[PDB]
Structure 1
Amino acid sequence: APLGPFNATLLEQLKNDYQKGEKEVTRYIELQEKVAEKYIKMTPLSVTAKKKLPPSKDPRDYMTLSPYWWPDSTKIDGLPYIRKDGERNPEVYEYPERENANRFGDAAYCLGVLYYITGKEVYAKACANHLRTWFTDPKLGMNPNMTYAQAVPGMKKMRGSGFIDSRRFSRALGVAKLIEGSKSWTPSDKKKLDDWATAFCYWMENSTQGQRESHAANNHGLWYEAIHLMVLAYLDRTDRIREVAEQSILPKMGAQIADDGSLPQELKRTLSLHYSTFALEALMEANQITSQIGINLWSTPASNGKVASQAVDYLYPFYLNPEDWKFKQIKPFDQSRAAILLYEAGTALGNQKYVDTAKRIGLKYSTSDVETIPYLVLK
């Protein structure tokens, strides 16, 4: 399989078994096709479908609200907003980008994965329509930046924390690699998307916000590098992937994991279990790319000898019984997230206990959750 944001082993296994005609994989893929018909029908979404415009007056600039920032009722205009950790301001849903990037990411990912597995041109055609409209269209396409991602009304300083939103569409970008060579994704389409990805990578690395986010001390830095790896894998910059893994990811991992395996920057949050898992999920998605070029982020040590498996070990008892979690977690934890994680770490470490627990927790066989497509092994 081409380089991309997916478990390449599972995707290749599904493709091979579907091509040979194995019964179980065949019926699973047929269910997935029934799930994807709605994405075939779905109208391609654009970042431009907003009424309230960013400070640039450009509807092609992505803009969202930072979720934990609320109007101050003690002020006449509510400004400046104040931060309430872990409490989502519903005003974030007045920025259509927030949920539309999620919808586009799901549609594109599903259609591209199913084209790769089945070879049916209809999935490549639909996926191309979604990619063209969101990325490269000269009117509907998103500008290759995140200047106004998670903006905060009343804040005078420039923030780069909104860059994490990119993970919603960067995955889609990577999945485009699966439809190259189809009849629907012309060399012209590929050239336009390559130019867009190069411009977005340049913005990533050279904007003040992108640099700031690249030096983030918590899960934001790890997710910045996961997004970076998706952009770099789409562009076939494998040497840059190696540079980023060894110069940025592994130092961040070695600084952010404590001696006992905990993640102190995430333990101080009101949703400490969620955010610990979120950091490990950044590492998981980054490893899906790095392991395709021979770099196992789960067992490769930082300069201080720490390894991400230490954090997985620290969290495992609380993935077994989330009630035992002793730090602040003011919302219920979705244990299904532990199913994929413990699988991805498990197979990456040969740890049969992690994989057995991942299967025991499991995923529901008929979920339309598109990131569970490659995981028939957990269903």
Structure 2
Amino acid sequence: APLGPFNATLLEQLKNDYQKGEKEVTRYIELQEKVAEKYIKMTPLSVTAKKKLPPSKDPRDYMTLSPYWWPDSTKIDGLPYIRKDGERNPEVYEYPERENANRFGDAAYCLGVLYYITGKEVYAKACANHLRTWFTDPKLGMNPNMTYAQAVPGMKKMRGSGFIDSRRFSRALGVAKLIEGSKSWTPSDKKKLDDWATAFCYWMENSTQGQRESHAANNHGLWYEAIHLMVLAYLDRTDRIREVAEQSILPKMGAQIADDGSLPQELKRTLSLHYSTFALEALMEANQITSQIGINLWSTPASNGKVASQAVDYLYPFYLNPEDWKFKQIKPFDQSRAAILLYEAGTALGNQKYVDTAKRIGLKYSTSDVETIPYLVLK
């Protein structure tokens, strides 16, 4: 499979069994095709579909509200907003690209993966329509920056924390590699998207917000590099992937994993079991890419000997019994998010207990959740 943001071993396995006519996989993929029909019909979304413009006056600039920031009722105008960690302010739904970037990413990811498995041009054609409109269209495509992501009303300082919103469309950028060679994805489409991704990568690496987010000491820094690797893999910069893993990701794990395997930065959050998991999910998506060029992020040590498997070990009994979690968790933890994580970490580590638990938790066979498409092994 081409380099991209997915378990390549599982995708290659699905395509091969589908091409041999294997009954269980053929039936599974035929279910997924029924699920994907809505994305063939879906009108492509654009970041420009908003009324309230960002301070640039440019509808092509992505803008969202940082989700944990609320108006202050003791201020006459509610300004400046104040932080309530773990409490999502419903005002976030006033910025259409918060949910539309998710809907776009799901649509393009599903369609590109189904084109890779089946070879049906109808999937590449629809994938291409979503990609062109979200990324490259000179009127409807988004500017390659995250300047106004997770803005906060009244906040004086610039922040890079909104960059983490990019993971919702950077997975779609990576899956675009899967539709290269189709009739629908022309050399002109590829050149424009190569150019967009080059500009997005430039902004990521050199803007102040990008720089600050690259140095964040919690899951923001881990997710930044997961996104970075998606952009770099799209652009075939395998040398850069090696450098990022060795000079950013591994040092970050070494600093963020404690000696007992806990993630102290996540333990002080109000949703601490969720944010411990979210950190490892960032490592999990990074590893899907690094392991396609021979770097296993679950078992490769930092310079201090700490390994990401130690973080899984610490959390494993709490994936078995979330009720035993002893740190602040002000909403219930969804055990199901452990399923793909424990499968990913278990296979990478040869840890059969992890894989068994991933299957016992499982995923629903007929779920339409697009990220579960490769994981028939869990359904």
- TM-score for both structures, normalised by structure 2: 1.00
Distance 2:25 2:333 in 1: 30
Calculate percent identity across the aligned residue pairs.
Answer: 100
Distance 1:262 1:320 in 2: 16
Over residues 341-366 of structure 1, what are the superposed CA-to-partner deviations in whole Å (9 max), with x where a residue is unaligned? 00000000000000000000000000
Distance 2:208 2:138 in 1: 26
Distance 1:313 1:363 in 2: 22
The CA deviation at 1:336 is: 1.0
Over residues 266-313 of structure 1, what are the superposed CA-to-partner deviations in whole Å (9 max), with x where a residue is unaligned? 000000000000000000000000000000000000000000000000
Over residues 200-256 of structure 1, what are the superposed CA-to-partner deviations in whole Å (9 max), with x where a residue is unaligned? 000000000000000000000000000000000000000000000000000000000
The CA deviation at 1:43 is: 0.3
Unaligned runs of 5+ in 2: none
The CA deviation at 1:76 is: 1.0
Determine whether 1:150 maps to 2:150: yes
Secondary structure at 1:209 match in 2: helix
Distance 1:349 1:82 in 2: 42
Determine whether 1:272 maps to 2:272: yes
Secondary structure at 2:266 match in 1: helix
Over residues 4-30 of structure 1, what are the superposed CA-to-partner deviations in whole Å (9 max), with x where a residue is unaligned? 000000000000000000000000000
Secondary structure at 1:150 match in 2: strand
Over residues 303-329 of structure 1, what are the superposed CA-to-partner deviations in whole Å (9 max), with x where a residue is unaligned? 000000000000000000111001110
Unaligned runs of 5+ in 1: none
Over residues 141-190 of structure 1, what are the superposed CA-to-partner deviations in whole Å (9 max), with x where a residue is unaligned? 00000000000000010000000000000000000000000000000000
Distance 1:205 1:36 in 2: 35
State the match for 1:220 in structure 2: 220
Over residues 104-126 of structure 1, what are the superposed CA-to-partner deviations in whole Å (9 max), with x where a residue is unaligned? 00000000000000000000000
The CA deviation at 1:334 is: 1.1
Secondary structure at 1:149 match in 2: strand
Give the CA RMSD over aligned residues. 0.3
Matches within 5 A, 1:36-185: 36-185=36-185
Distance 2:331 2:27 in 1: 36
Distance 2:153 2:133 in 1: 29
State the match for 1:330 in structure 2: 330
Distance 1:245 1:343 in 2: 21
Secondary structure at 2:225 match in 1: helix
Secondary structure at 2:286 match in 1: helix
Determine whether 1:193 maps to 2:193: yes
Secondary structure at 1:64 match in 2: strand
Secondary structure at 2:109 match in 1: helix
Secondary structure at 1:4 match in 2: coil
State the match for 1:2 in structure 2: 2
Over residues 39-67 of structure 1, what are the superposed CA-to-partner deviations in whole Å (9 max), with x where a residue is unaligned? 00000000000000000000000000000
The CA deviation at 1:34 is: 0.1
Distance 2:253 2:4 in 1: 22
